[PDB]
């Protein structure tokens, strides 16, 4: 009704002159936001010996009070590639480790996983045994030493290996014919694969896993959960900040 300004008639609104651009919406770009390293997960090393289990790279159903957790939960289907940074931080005395090789093995979505120490290295009496699936071969094996290491880390890029054209972040159905409470929001292979960290350190320290998601694509936006509580009616939340009145 009437539309634009200053007569005050019913339905009439005053003039507004829209602002000019400046930032160009570059920062709200989906793939820009996800192409950075995020500290998601922290994990323990397995001993060289025994029958270790692989850790699945699935950052999807998180509750973590971190920016990547909510963000990954903003869409229904997701596709992206992956980059990893694995670091190693001592939890004991750094002089406990004189060599400290760490074998990292990455497995594509669908890879077989049973391993037991099976590859023997021999030298002057004593010997060392590594896992059947830690050896360098078909899938990537990375070996880094923690001892004098200036960064006690490694890192590499890996692609989207799932069989699904897109990863369902939410799934209204079951991933298996038997409909068990377990296979509910499920679907097999909705992830990035799995890794196996193995080392004579294992005690002595842990890791720090960071994910970077290059080439991200999101489908079907979903509601974004709050993050903070609701302040009192008619008030404003007040947070500590850079700006703030001294």
């Amino acid at each position: 009704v009437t539309n634009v300004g200053e007569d005050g008639e019913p339905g009439e609104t005053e003039p507004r002159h829209a602002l000019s651009p400046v930032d160009m919406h570059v920062h709200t770009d989906v793939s820009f936001l996800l192409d950075r390293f995020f500290d998601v997960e922290t994990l323990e090393l397995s001993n060289l010996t025994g029958s270790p289990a692989t850790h699945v790279l699935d950052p999807f159903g998180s509750t973590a009070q971190l920016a990547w957790a909510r963000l990954l939960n903003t869409c229904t289907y997701f596709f992206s590639d992956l980059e990893l940074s694995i670091q190693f931080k001592f939890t004991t005395t750094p002089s406990s480790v004189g060599e400290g090789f760490v074998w990292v093995k990455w497995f594509p979505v669908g890879a077989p996983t049973k391993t037991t120490d099976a590859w023997q290295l021999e030298g002057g009496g004593n010997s060392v045994r590594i896992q059947q699936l830690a050896v360098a071969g078909m899938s990537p094996t990375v070996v880094f030493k923690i001892a004098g290491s200036r960064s006690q880390a490694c890192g590499f890029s890996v692609p989207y290996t799932s069989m699904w054209r897109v990863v369902p972040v939410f799934y209204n159905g079951w991933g298996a014919p038997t409909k068990e409470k377990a296979t509910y929001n499920w679907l097999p292979g909705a992830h990035f694969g799995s890794i196996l960290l193995t080392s004579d350190a294992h005690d002595k320290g842990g890791c720090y896993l960071r994910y970077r998601f290059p080439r991200a694509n999101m489908y079907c936006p979903r509601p974004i959960p709050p993050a903070f509580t609701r302040p009192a009616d008619k008030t404003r939340h007040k947070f500590p900040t850079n700006i703030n009145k001294q």
Binding site: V22, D23, M24, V26, H27, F32
Partner: protein, 226 residues
């Protein structure tokens, strides 16, 4: 395929002024248009297009009275470290550099009343045994006669005369690149007034600007205060 590389001995060192940038970690920030008047790009321009007042005994001027003659009213040695150049923009800007080149422009502004008049002789005296004590001595040098009452303001250029292409900003015990001589102002006549009881003295403000050929090079870090 891995490239053969040889690590230079100065390898992991710092070197503060390297002509190169660090790695960026927060890309793509478009900054708002900054209209805002008065941007300056080179300090030498504001030094040349602007004047400051000297510090003659703590005041920005010297005085002539109805009793003057002979003796110099203003005297300063030509060095940016001179005392009377103390509070100035040009002197202060200079402390950021090691060497300077060029002339300084001084302009005197007579602020005595309109009913007042006096004449000044301003001389540029080159390095010498010891600085003239009377004007008949200095008048042998480069000088100009300023008759107030012709122009109330007078500009005088202290030239650059030296065998070196640049001289030192930070002076010390006299060296060949430390000092360039003296600038003096004498009273050719004492102040005359319509009534000596009302106006007995008049003040000449003295301001400095960087000359057209003035320049500063070699940025330097600030030493202990003194």
């Amino acid at each position: 395929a891995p490239i053969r590389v040889v690590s230079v001995p100065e390898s992991d060192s710092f070197m503060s002024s390297v002509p190169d940038n660090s790695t960026p970690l927060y890309p793509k920030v478009v900054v708002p248009p900054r209209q805002v008047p008065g941007r300056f790009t080179n300090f030498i321009d504001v030094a040349k297009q602007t004047y400051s007042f000297c510090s003659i005994s703590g005041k920005p001027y010297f005085e002539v009275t109805n009793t003057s003659g002979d003796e110099p009213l203003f005297q300063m040695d030509v060095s940016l470290s001179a005392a009377e150049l103390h509070g100035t923009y040009v002197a202060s800007l200079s402390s950021f550099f090691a060497q300077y080149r060029g002339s300084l422009n001084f302009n005197f502004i007579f602020t005595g009343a309109a009913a007042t008049k006096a004449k000044f002789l301003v001389a540029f005296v080159p390095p010498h045994s010891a600085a003239p004590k009377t004007r008949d001595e200095a008048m042998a040098c480069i000088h100009a006669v300023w008759d107030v009452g012709l122009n109330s303001a007078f500009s005088f250029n202290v030239p650059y005369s030296s065998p070196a292409d640049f001289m030192a900003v930070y002076s010390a015990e006299a060296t060949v690149v430390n000092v360039s001589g003296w600038l003096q102002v004498y009273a050719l006549t004492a102040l005359t007034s319509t009534d000596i009881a009302v106006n007995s003295k008049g003040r000449v403000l003295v301001a400095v600007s960087a000359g057209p050929d003035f320049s500063l090079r070699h940025p330097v870090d600030l030493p202990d205060k003194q």
